[PDB]
């Protein structure tokens, strides 16, 4: 792949093999010479088939087990792409056994290798996409609840509301902390960490903004308009941040 890989895990699995395909490209096809014999690939190529067979095994269980719908539609084509790519590798080994200098077979090696890595890439991005959708779900849930601070006019409720939004924040903070460590783009990690930090420190402020309101909302005096404008401003500010976080999570090259 030309663009940097989306995450550290994907980079770890593909980057190295992608380099090899490049070396093989430079070597044989699209490079200096290529016909000087090619040992028997039957052994290793059989190993890929097995591996591929297992990957498709695991992936299919994943399909009939996940609740995500997109994952259910997106993963299956990857099995095929991979399975079909594997077919070319087997046909290539075969040809090579008949002729070590066969170029269409060499073309098949590169083609079959690319299909497997590409199809394995789609499988990991699909899976990754499904994971980010879990984080977003959490974020939108916090968004939905933040829109509830609007009511709350009693210390009792304010304490309840607090008892609920607290763990939400803690949960969103962990996911984004760990997801951030996986990004392969500096700027994206940075943007996320800042948004999350800005949100972590606005929590105590939202709670104070709320305590302020409930109090004045229970005191026959006090200028309620002010408390309102500010509590709302704090919610408007926490929301924008969280949407920024949602936006950044879906950023891909």
């Amino acid at each position: 792949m030309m663009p940097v890989f989306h995450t550290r895990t994907i980079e770890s699995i593909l980057e190295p093999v992608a380099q090899q395909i490049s070396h093989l490209v430079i070597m044989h096809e699209e490079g200096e010479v290529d016909g000087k014999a090619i040992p028997d690939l039957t052994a290793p190529v059989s190993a890929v088939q097995a591996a591929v067979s297992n990957l498709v095994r695991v992936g299919k269980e994943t399909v009939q087990t996940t609740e995500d719908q997109i994952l259910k539609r997106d993963m299956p084509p990857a099995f095929i792409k991979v399975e079909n790519a594997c077919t070319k590798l087997v046909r290539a080994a075969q040809m090579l056994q008949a002729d070590p200098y066969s170029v269409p077979a060499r073309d098949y090696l590169i083609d079959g290798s690319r299909g497997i890595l590409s199809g394995t890439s789609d499988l990991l991005l699909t899976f990754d996409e499904a994971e980010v959708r879990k984080i977003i779900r959490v974020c939108k849930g916090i968004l939905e609840y933040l829109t509830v601070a609007e009511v709350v006019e009693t210390m009792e409720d304010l304490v309840t509301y607090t008892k609920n939004l607290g763990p939400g924040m803690t949960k969103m903070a962990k996911m984004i902390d760990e997801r951030q460590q996986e990004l392969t783009h500096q700027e994206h990690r940075v943007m996320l960490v800042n948004s999350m930090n800005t949100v972590k420190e606005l929590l105590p402020v939202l709670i104070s903004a709320m305590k302020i309101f409930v109090t004045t909302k229970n005191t026959k005096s006090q200028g309620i308009e002010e408390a309102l404008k500010n509590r709302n401003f704090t919610v408007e500010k926490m929301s924008a941040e969280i949407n920024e976080i949602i936006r950044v999570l879906q950023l891909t090259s």
Partner: peptide, 24 residues
């Protein structure tokens, strides 16, 4: 799980081994 990610790593390492035989 991480089972999916592990089997994806094998296919990769098994393919790598294939290119390694091509001295690539």
């Amino acid at each position: 799980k991480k089972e999916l990610i592990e089997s994806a790593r094998k296919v990769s390492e098994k393919v790598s081994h294939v290119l390694a035989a091509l001295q690539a």
